[PDB]
Write a protein that binds this ligand. Structure first.
Ligand code: HEM
Length: 151
């Protein structure tokens, strides 16, 4: 569980992401694709992009990153009480996009990577631990929803 204090560490650094949602989204997606090229291959809409220059030039990829971080921001602001936000996400990702649960672990690592790179002053050991726990709770609730939907 996170304490209220730990939720504040999470929402404090998230307010730094919210200063530049689009730029953070691009850095996280590019990090994910570089770390785990199987993830890009699974994105029919984006799999054409072959290089980092092409990825940073894609307005579609940029708008997608904004959707992702907007949805995740709304989830984190619920401080674990995200059942309602998770339902449509689990539904689309299990049954429509067919995203393997492991990919949610990979994007969590990519989020930690970018937060650390851009906000080290707001991402000390306690803030890193709090964000890891918040994303782990998210991933595990999605995993349980995946299984409930038969995926
Ligand atoms: C924090 C984790 C995630 C959040 C909050 C998130 C959120 C979203 C949202 C809000 C959309 C548009 C609405 C919808 O279809 O549900 C979406 C679409 C999609 N997402 Fe995720 N998502 C994440 C994890 C992933 C991962 C790990 C991948 C890697 C393949 C992924 C790829 C998919 C794809 C392929 C679409 C459709 C994009 C398109 O072609 O328009 N997402 N996501």
């Amino acid at each position: 569980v996170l304490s209220e204090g730990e939720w504040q560490l999470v929402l404090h650094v998230w307010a730094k992401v919210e200063a530049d949602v689009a730029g953070h989204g691009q850095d996280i997606l590019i990090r994910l694709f570089k770390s785990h090229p199987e993830t890009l291959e699974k994105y029919d809409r984006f799999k054409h992009l072959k290089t980092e220059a092409e990825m940073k030039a894609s307005e579609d990829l940029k708008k997608h990153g904004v959707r992702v971080l907007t949805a995740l921001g709304a989830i984190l602001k619920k401080k674990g009480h995200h059942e309602a936000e998770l339902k449509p996400l689990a539904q689309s990702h299990a049954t429509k996009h067919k995203i393997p649960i492991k990919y949610l672990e990979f994007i969590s690592e990519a989020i930690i990577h970018v937060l650390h790179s851009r906000h080290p002053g707001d991402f000390g050991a306690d803030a890193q631990g709090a964000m890891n726990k918040a994303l782990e709770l998210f991933r595990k609730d999605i995993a349980a929803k995946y299984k409930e939907l038969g995926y």
